[PDB]
Amino acid sequence: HEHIYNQRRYMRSELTAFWIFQDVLHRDTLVKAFLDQVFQLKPGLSLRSTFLAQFLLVLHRKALTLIKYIEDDTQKGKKPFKSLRNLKIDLDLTAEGDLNIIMALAEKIKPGLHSFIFG
Amino acid sequence: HEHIYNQRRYMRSELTAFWIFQDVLHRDTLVKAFLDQVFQLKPGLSLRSTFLAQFLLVLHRKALTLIKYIEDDTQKGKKPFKSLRNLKIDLDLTAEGDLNIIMALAEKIKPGLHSFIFG
Amino acid sequence: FILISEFSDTKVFGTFDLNYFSLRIMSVDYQASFVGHPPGSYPKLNFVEDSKEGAFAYVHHLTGFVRPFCMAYISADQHKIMQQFQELSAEFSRASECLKTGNRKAFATEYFTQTLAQLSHIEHMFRGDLCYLLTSQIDRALLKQQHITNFLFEDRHKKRAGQNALKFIRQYPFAHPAIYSLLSGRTLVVLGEDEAIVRKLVTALAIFVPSYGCYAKPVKHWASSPLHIMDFQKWKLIGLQRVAGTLHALSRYSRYTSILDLDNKTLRCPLYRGTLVPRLADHRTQIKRGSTYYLHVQSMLTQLCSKAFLYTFCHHLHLPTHDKETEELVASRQMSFLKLTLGLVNEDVRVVQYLAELLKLHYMQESPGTSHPMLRFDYVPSFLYK
Amino acid sequence: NPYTELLVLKAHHDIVRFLVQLDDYRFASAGDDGIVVVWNAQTGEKLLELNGHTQKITAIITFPLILTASADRTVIVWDGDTTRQVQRISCFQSTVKCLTVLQRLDVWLSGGNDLCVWNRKLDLLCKTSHLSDTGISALVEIPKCVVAAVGKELIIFRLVAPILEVKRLLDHQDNILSLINVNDLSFVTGSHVGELIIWDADTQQEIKLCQKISIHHFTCDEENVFAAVGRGLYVYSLQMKRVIACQKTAHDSNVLHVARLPNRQLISCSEDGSVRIWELRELIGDLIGHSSSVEMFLYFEDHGLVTCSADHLIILWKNGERESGLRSLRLFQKLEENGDLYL
C-alpha cells in the first residue's frame, strides 16, 4: 500500500518535470513450522514435494478464506474495514509476520486489499 | 475453576458416604523472553536480581490492570464477563499460555475470577 | 450481472437472460459495428478495450452470402478477460466447430441447440469472478499434486452443510468432545426422533469425518435398527430414532459410541481437554455466512491431514532403531514426536494417531472397512455429560 | 485389556457353534446351517465354503482333512484347498454326535448310538458295536489303547487291536454332561446336577464333590481343575483336594465354555454374550462384542482370539499396538520396493 502510494508520488512528481531497503520487520510461524518439520522426511522419495504442495494448499486456502472474510465483513467494499483484530484471532493469524504471507497472496490474487485495510 | 468445581464434586461426593496430571497445554512469551535475556547480564554483580524484580513488577502490574479491566468491564460483577478477546488484544496477551500467568496472579490476589470468566 | 450476446452488423439474439430488465440498459448497437471488421479480417480472433470492457471477439465465417458473423463476450473488468485468454480461446474455437463442421455440411439449424447449450455452459463455468477462477485453478493443480491425503476430506450444498455446522457449534454446548469423537474414530450415534432435525445434524456433522478410501462417505442417514456391531463397523455416525428401551440396550455397546440425545440434551463420550478441536471449532466465532466457515474448516483439516502425513511417513519413528524392539522406546519416541514437533496435547495425539492409521490403510491396499474392517477402539471411560 | 481392535466376520445364517484350528493362520466355523466356511485369521477374508450337508451340525474335527457329521445320518469327509466332497459316508441309523480322533493309531471314531472304528485313507470300517440305547454324548482317549465313552449316565470303556471290550463303571446320579482328559493319569467328568467326580487311569474313583447350579465344562490345569457351573467359576485342586478360592458370581446368566491361555490367564464364555479374562492370583477385562449367547472360542498365539455366537457373527480380537506396527512395517517395505511414492 505504501509501495503503490509512493509509486504514485514518484510517478506524479517525475511527470511534473517540465509540465531504502528497510530490513525484515518480524518473523512468522507457518514457515518456521514447515521448515522445521520438512527435513525429517526423506529427500528422494517424492515426499517433500507432496508435503510442500500441502503447505501451498493450506496457504492458498487461507488466502481464499481471508478474501471471503473481508468480502463479507463489509458488504463487498461498501463500509471501511475496521475488523483486523477478530480476523487475526479467528483465522489463526495472531502473528502479524504470518499474517503478511496470507495477506500478500490474497493481494496477489485479489488486488486492492492493502489500500482498503492499511492505507 | 475446574479445580474448585471438581473439589466441590469430590468433597460433596465423599460427604455423601453414610449420610490425573494432564501435561502442559502451551507455552508463553514473557518467560521465554525473560529467560532468553537474563543470562547475558553478569551473575555476581546484583544485576539479575534487579532485572528479576523488574520482571515481577511488570507481572504484578499487568495483574492489577487485568483486575481493573475486568472490574470495570462489567459493573464490578453485575453482568457476565463476555469480554476475553478485547482483553487479550488490548493488554498484550494474545497468547493464552502467557495469559494464564497474569490470570493466575490475578486470581491469587483477587479470588473468584476463573469461575466468573471460564466456568 | 454481466452480459453475453452475438454480433451480425447488429444484434442477433441475447443469451444471458434473453433481454432482461434494468440489469441490461446499454444498447448492443454500441457494441455492434465496432467489434466487426473495420480492417476487414482465416480464423481471426482479437481483443480490444473500448472503455464496460471489450472482450473476446472470435471472428467466424460462413462460406452462402451471409459472411460477417462474429460471436462476442463482455464482462466487468479488464484482467478477467485478458488474463483468461487461454481458456477463452480454446473453448470458443471448439464450440464454433459445432457450427463450422456443422453448417459446413449443408451447402453441397440442426446443431443450433448444441451451440445454445455449449455457450450457456461457457458462461456458467465462467460465471463467477476473476479471483474465484484463479483460486479454483490453483486448488485444481495442488489437488493434482497431492494424491494420498485427499480422500480424508475431499468429499452448492456445502453452503447448507457448513452453515448448519456453524449453527451447530455456536448453538450447542459440549460439542468439542462430539467433534473429537468424530475426528478420533468413535461412532457418533445421533439418536432422536423428528427425522429432519436428525438429518440436518447428520449432513452438518458429515464434514468432520475422515472417510475410509476413494469412495463416498461412511455416513448413514437415519437408520432404524438395534445396531449390533456390524453397523458400527461400516458407519461412523448413525442417525437413530426414538420410539415411544433403545437407550438401555444400546449402552451395552458403550465402548464404541457417543450417544448424542436430541430430546434429552446429553451425550456420553470420553473427556476432551485439548486445543486442536477448539481451533477447529471455537465457542464464539465472529465468522458470518458459514460457507466461509466451511472454507476455514477445509483449510484447517488440510493442515491436520498434513500432520498425519508427516507422522505416517517419518522413517525414524516407525522403523525401530534397535536390534530388539521395545514398545516403551518406540511408544515414548512416537509420543515425543507428537508432543514436541507437532504440538499436540493429550487427545489430539489420539486424533492424529487415528488419521495416520486411515492413511496407512489407504496407501497399503486401498481397502479399510471393506476387506480389512479394523475397528480400533480403546478402554477410556466415557462420562455422561449434562 | 490389550485387545483393542475387532474385525467381524459374516457368512452364516444359522447358529454358529463350532470352531477348529487347521494351521496357524486360518480356522473353520461350522454352524447349524450345515455349511463349513474356512476363514483367514491374519486378515479376515473367507476362503471357501464347504456346503452339502442338509440339516444342522453335530460335531466337526480336523484330521491331519475336515471330517464332519450332521443331523441327517451322514458324514462328509473334506479337505483344504479343494472345495469338493471327498466321501459321503451314510451308514448310520442314528445321528452321529462325536468325532474324537485318536492321534496315536490314526483312527477316526463315531458316536451314532454305537461305536464304529474307521480308517485313514482307504476309508473303511474296522469294528462295530451297539452298546447304547440313548446316544453317545462324549468321547475321550486315555492310555494303557483304551477309549472312554458315556452311554447316558455310565462311563463305558473300550480297547483297540488289529476289536474292543466293555469295562462298565457306572456309579453316578444323573446323565453326564461333560468329559475331559488331563495331562495324564486321570480324567474328569461332571453330572448334570453338579457332581464333579474325578477318576484315575484303569484305576479307582477319587472324590465325590458337593457344594457346587449345573456344571457345563472343564479345563485341565493339572495342578488344579477349572469347572464351569451356572454363573460360577468354582476351582478345584489336585494336590490340596479342596476348593481353591472361587467366584460365586462371574457372569450374569451362565458359564458354558471355559479354557486357558498359556500366559496364566483364565477366560470364559457366558450366555449373555460376554467374554472375560481372569488372573489366578481377579478379573481383568471384558470383551463385550456379541449380542446373544456366545458359544465357543479359540486362541491363536501369534494373532488374537476368535469368538462365535448365536447371532451368526464371528469376531477376531487383535490388539491395537502390536497389529498397528505391522501396517507401518509393510508400508516402508512397499515404498522402497516401489522406488517412488506415486509410481
Side-chain angles (χ1 to χ4, degrees), chain A, chain B, chain C residues 1-6 8-43 45-50 52-385, chain D residues 1-143 145-152 155-172 174-320 322-339 341-342:
Chain A
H1 64 280
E2 296 178 355
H3 184 77
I4 292 168
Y5 186 76
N6 293 320
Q7 181 176 3
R8 184 175 293 170
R9 285 185 178 177
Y10 189 76
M11 186 180 74
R12 180 176 291 174
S13 67
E14 286 293 326
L15 288 176
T16 57
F18 293 104
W19 180 260
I20 66 164
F21 288 104
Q22 192 63 255
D23 292 333
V24 179
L25 270 294
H26 49 276
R27 291 183 290 113
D28 52 356
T29 180
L30 290 176
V31 179
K32 183 176 174 65
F34 177 78
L35 269 70
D36 193 3
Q37 72 193 1
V38 162
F39 291 95
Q40 294 173 354
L41 297 173
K42 292 293 182 183
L45 296 170
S46 178
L47 295 171
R48 294 175 185 265
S49 66
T50 303
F51 192 76
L52 182 273
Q54 294 173 356
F55 178 67
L56 294 174
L57 186 62
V58 64
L59 288 173
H60 289 93
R61 287 181 182 176
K62 284 179 182 179
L64 182 56
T65 186
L66 187 143
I67 286 172
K68 292 297 289 183
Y69 185 68
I70 297 174
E71 187 178 2
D72 63 4
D73 181 75
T74 181
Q75 301 294 322
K76 199 186 288 186
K78 183 257 285 182
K79 189 180 261 77
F81 179 70
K82 204 179 75 174
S83 179
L84 183 61
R85 295 175 183 175
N86 289 321
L87 189 149
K88 285 171 94 286
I89 61 167
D90 283 331
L91 275 302
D92 196 74
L93 291 170
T94 59
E96 179 72 30
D98 195 73
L99 176 61
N100 293 320
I101 291 172
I102 302 301
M103 192 65 70
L105 297 178
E107 180 68 30
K108 189 172 74 173
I109 45 93
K110 182 178 182 290
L113 293 173
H114 284 270
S115 296
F116 179 72
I117 65 170
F118 289 162
Chain B
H1 64 280
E2 296 178 354
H3 184 77
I4 292 168
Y5 186 76
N6 293 320
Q7 181 176 3
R8 184 175 293 170
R9 285 186 178 177
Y10 189 76
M11 186 180 74
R12 180 176 291 174
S13 67
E14 286 293 326
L15 288 176
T16 57
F18 293 104
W19 180 260
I20 66 164
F21 288 104
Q22 192 63 255
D23 292 333
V24 179
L25 270 294
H26 49 276
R27 291 183 290 113
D28 52 356
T29 180
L30 290 176
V31 179
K32 183 176 174 64
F34 177 78
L35 269 70
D36 193 3
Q37 72 193 1
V38 162
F39 291 95
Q40 294 173 354
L41 297 173
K42 292 293 182 183
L45 296 170
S46 178
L47 295 171
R48 294 175 185 265
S49 66
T50 303
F51 192 76
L52 182 273
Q54 294 173 356
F55 178 67
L56 294 174
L57 186 62
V58 64
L59 288 173
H60 289 93
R61 287 181 182 176
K62 284 179 182 179
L64 183 56
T65 186
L66 187 143
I67 286 172
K68 292 297 289 183
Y69 185 68
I70 297 174
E71 187 178 2
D72 63 4
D73 181 75
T74 181
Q75 301 294 322
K76 199 186 288 186
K78 183 257 285 181
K79 189 180 261 77
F81 179 70
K82 204 179 75 174
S83 179
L84 183 61
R85 295 175 183 175
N86 289 321
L87 189 149
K88 285 171 94 286
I89 61 167
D90 283 331
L91 275 302
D92 196 74
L93 291 170
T94 59
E96 179 72 30
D98 195 73
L99 176 61
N100 293 320
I101 291 173
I102 302 301
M103 192 65 70
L105 297 178
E107 180 68 30
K108 189 172 74 173
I109 45 93
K110 182 178 182 290
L113 293 173
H114 284 270
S115 296
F116 179 72
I117 65 170
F118 289 162
Chain C
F1 180 75
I2 64 171
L3 276 300
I4 186 166
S5 67
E6 297 292 326
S8 179
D9 54 355
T10 184
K11 184 259 289 181
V12 181
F13 66 98
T15 315
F16 180 75
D17 206 359
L18 280 76
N19 290 317
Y20 190 68
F21 291 159
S22 296
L23 293 174
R24 193 266 301 163
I25 293 172
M26 61 90 206
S27 67
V28 188
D29 292 331
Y30 289 163
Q31 298 292 322
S33 68
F34 291 159
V35 77
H37 54 282
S41 294
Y42 292 159
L45 56 93
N46 52 4
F47 180 74
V48 297
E49 175 174 358
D50 290 331
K52 291 172 71 176
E53 295 291 326
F56 190 71
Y58 182 76
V59 178
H60 186 72
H61 62 88
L62 273 299
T63 187
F65 183 72
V66 282
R67 294 178 179 91
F69 179 75
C70 66
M71 56 185 177
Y73 186 74
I74 196 166
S75 180
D77 52 354
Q78 184 71 257
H79 296 286
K80 184 187 287 186
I81 311 161
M82 183 59 209
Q83 193 69 43
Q84 298 177 357
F85 180 75
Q86 190 65 40
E87 65 183 2
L88 285 168
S89 68
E91 291 182 354
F92 281 165
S93 178
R94 189 175 63 245
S96 66
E97 294 293 326
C98 295
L99 184 64
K100 191 172 182 179
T101 64
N103 206 2
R104 79 171 63 189
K105 187 176 180 180
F107 70 97
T109 185
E110 185 177 1
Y111 290 165
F112 185 74
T113 312
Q114 184 63 255
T115 61
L116 271 71
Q118 183 69 41
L119 195 149
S120 179
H121 187 273
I122 297 301
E123 65 92 20
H124 184 76
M125 71 179 288
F126 291 157
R127 188 264 308 275
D129 202 78
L130 184 271
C131 65
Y132 289 166
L133 293 177
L134 292 176
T135 58
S136 296
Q137 285 175 353
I138 293 169
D139 290 333
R140 182 179 296 114
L142 290 173
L143 289 173
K144 287 288 182 67
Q145 285 295 110
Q146 65 168 353
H147 199 198
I148 296 175
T149 63
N150 201 3
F151 76 106
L152 286 167
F153 293 101
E154 68 95 19
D155 185 75
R156 271 73 172 174
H157 296 285
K158 300 288 103 178
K159 187 267 297 295
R160 187 70 183 274
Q163 185 177 2
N164 291 318
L166 183 143
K167 291 181 181 180
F168 171 73
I169 290 161
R170 69 177 179 90
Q171 201 181 1
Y172 180 78
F174 49 88
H176 296 88
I179 297 171
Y180 167 66
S181 69
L182 287 175
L183 295 170
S184 65
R186 186 69 64 88
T187 71
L188 184 67
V189 183
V190 177
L191 191 144
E193 61 186 2
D194 196 0
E195 183 182 2
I197 298 172
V198 180
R199 291 290 294 268
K200 264 61 185 298
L201 265 289
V202 161
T203 58
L205 292 174
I207 300 168
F208 295 101
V209 179
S211 66
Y212 295 110
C214 58
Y215 58 93
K217 285 301 293 294
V219 70
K220 178 64 178 176
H221 296 87
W222 187 68
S224 180
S225 63
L227 297 190
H228 311 289
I229 48 168
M230 198 65 204
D231 296 330
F232 293 163
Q233 183 70 55
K234 294 184 181 293
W235 291 280
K236 292 294 184 183
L237 70 92
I238 299 168
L240 290 180
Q241 61 180 354
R242 188 68 61 86
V243 173
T246 62
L247 292 173
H248 186 272
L250 187 62
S251 177
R252 186 256 185 85
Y253 294 103
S254 178
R255 279 83 176 273
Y256 319 107
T257 55
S258 297
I259 301 169
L260 190 145
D261 293 330
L262 271 297
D263 292 330
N264 295 319
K265 282 89 171 65
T266 60
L267 57 87
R268 293 179 179 89
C269 76
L271 288 172
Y272 182 72
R273 47 180 293 162
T275 192
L276 183 142
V277 180
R279 73 181 66 252
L280 268 76
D282 196 0
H283 185 274
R284 76 279 292 156
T285 55
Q286 299 301 110
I287 292 172
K288 187 168 85 272
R289 191 173 292 119
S291 176
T292 302
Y293 181 70
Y294 175 72
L295 289 175
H296 175 69
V297 174
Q298 188 63 255
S299 68
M300 195 67 71
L301 291 169
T302 306
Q303 191 178 4
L304 179 61
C305 294
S306 71
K307 284 192 257 74
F309 182 82
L310 180 66
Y311 170 64
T312 305
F313 282 100
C314 283
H315 283 78
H316 61 88
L317 272 71
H318 299 285
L319 289 176
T321 61
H322 195 270
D323 195 2
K324 300 285 102 175
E325 64 270 15
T326 300
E327 292 180 353
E328 296 289 327
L329 291 175
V330 68
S332 65
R333 186 174 66 188
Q334 288 174 356
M335 187 61 70
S336 69
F337 185 80
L338 283 90
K339 292 289 182 67
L340 295 176
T341 63
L342 295 175
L344 301 170
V345 50
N346 292 121
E347 285 87 3
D348 308 331
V349 58
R350 184 69 178 171
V351 175
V352 176
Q353 194 70 255
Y354 170 69
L355 272 72
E357 186 64 37
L358 293 179
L359 197 149
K360 294 174 190 177
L361 290 175
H362 186 207
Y363 177 75
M364 190 64 208
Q365 194 62 43
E366 290 90 5
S367 293
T370 62
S371 68
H372 295 284
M374 289 296 107
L375 201 148
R376 53 94 55 80
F377 64 95
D378 55 353
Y379 291 106
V380 176
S382 66
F383 285 172
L384 189 146
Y385 292 171
Chain D
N1 194 5
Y3 301 107
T4 54
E5 67 180 2
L6 59 93
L7 59 159
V8 181
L9 308 178
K10 52 180 286 187
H12 297 285
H13 59 91
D14 203 355
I15 293 169
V16 184
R17 298 176 70 90
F18 285 148
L19 273 73
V20 67
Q21 182 179 1
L22 282 80
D23 54 354
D24 53 356
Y25 66 96
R26 69 187 177 95
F27 62 96
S29 67
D32 292 334
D33 277 324
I35 63 172
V36 177
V37 54
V38 297
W39 297 91
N40 192 2
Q42 181 67 43
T43 63
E45 180 183 0
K46 63 185 289 184
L47 300 177
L48 53 92
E49 290 184 353
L50 297 174
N51 196 358
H53 291 96
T54 64
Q55 293 178 356
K56 69 183 289 294
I57 213 73
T58 55
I60 64 168
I61 205 68
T62 294
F63 185 78
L65 279 74
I66 300 170
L67 278 76
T68 302
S70 178
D72 57 353
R73 279 79 178 270
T74 187
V75 176
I76 299 174
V77 178
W78 273 327
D79 51 349
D81 204 3
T82 304
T83 318
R84 289 182 65 189
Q85 293 181 357
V86 178
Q87 197 65 41
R88 188 64 182 268
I89 299 100
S90 178
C91 59
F92 301 99
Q93 297 296 320
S94 179
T95 301
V96 178
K97 292 187 286 185
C98 292
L99 275 76
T100 303
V101 174
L102 177 62
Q103 66 183 357
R104 297 289 301 274
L105 279 76
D106 66 10
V107 161
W108 175 60
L109 295 173
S110 68
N113 205 3
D114 56 355
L115 181 65
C116 62
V117 176
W118 291 92
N119 196 0
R120 185 177 180 179
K121 260 61 185 298
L122 272 297
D123 198 0
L124 279 75
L125 285 168
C126 294
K127 180 57 69 177
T128 307
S129 298
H130 191 272
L131 292 174
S132 177
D133 195 73
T134 301
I136 307 299
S137 65
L139 268 296
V140 73
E141 287 87 2
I142 202 66
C145 298
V146 176
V147 177
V150 172
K152 182 178 179 180
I155 302 166
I156 308 169
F157 293 92
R158 297 291 182 271
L159 191 143
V160 70
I163 297 95
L164 51 87
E165 292 177 353
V166 287
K167 196 171 73 176
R168 294 181 180 178
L169 181 144
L170 190 148
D171 193 74
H172 288 294
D174 200 359
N175 51 3
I176 304 302
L177 190 59
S178 297
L179 170 58
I180 202 167
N181 198 359
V182 298
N183 55 356
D184 199 358
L185 282 73
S186 179
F187 63 97
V188 178
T189 78
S191 297
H192 185 272
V193 294
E195 293 290 325
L196 197 153
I197 307 167
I198 302 100
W199 287 265
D200 289 333
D202 54 354
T203 321
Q204 187 63 41
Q205 189 275 126
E206 299 294 326
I207 315 99
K208 186 64 176 65
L209 283 86
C210 65
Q211 186 267 331
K212 60 177 68 177
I213 304 299
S214 178
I215 204 165
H216 289 282
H217 201 270
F218 296 98
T219 295
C220 175
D221 194 0
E222 70 272 15
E223 64 180 1
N224 52 2
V225 72
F226 292 150
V229 78
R231 62 185 291 166
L233 286 177
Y234 297 159
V235 171
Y236 180 66
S237 179
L238 269 297
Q239 298 294 320
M240 196 181 288
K241 296 290 190 292
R242 65 179 292 274
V243 175
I244 304 174
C246 67
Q247 185 69 40
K248 300 292 183 183
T249 299
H251 292 281
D252 290 331
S253 177
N254 288 114
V255 175
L256 56 91
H257 189 274
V258 288
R260 179 176 175 269
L261 271 69
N263 57 4
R264 298 290 177 90
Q265 292 176 355
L266 265 302
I267 187 163
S268 77
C269 282
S270 176
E271 201 269 331
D272 57 352
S274 66
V275 181
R276 294 183 178 181
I277 301 98
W278 287 270
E279 189 179 0
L280 197 148
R281 295 294 186 186
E282 185 180 0
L283 189 146
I284 296 173
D286 294 332
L287 289 177
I288 301 297
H290 289 283
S291 297
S292 64
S293 179
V294 298
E295 191 70 27
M296 192 177 175
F297 58 88
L298 184 64
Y299 181 73
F300 291 97
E301 184 176 0
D302 289 331
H303 48 278
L305 74 153
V306 186
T307 63
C308 71
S309 296
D311 63 355
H312 314 97
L313 295 175
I314 291 95
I315 294 174
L316 265 290
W317 293 92
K318 280 91 168 63
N319 49 3
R322 189 259 186 276
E323 291 288 328
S324 177
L326 295 177
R327 268 79 65 89
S328 68
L329 198 280
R330 295 176 294 172
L331 191 146
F332 289 153
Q333 179 65 254
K334 187 256 183 65
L335 185 143
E336 71 178 3
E337 184 179 2
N338 201 2
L341 187 271
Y342 284 159

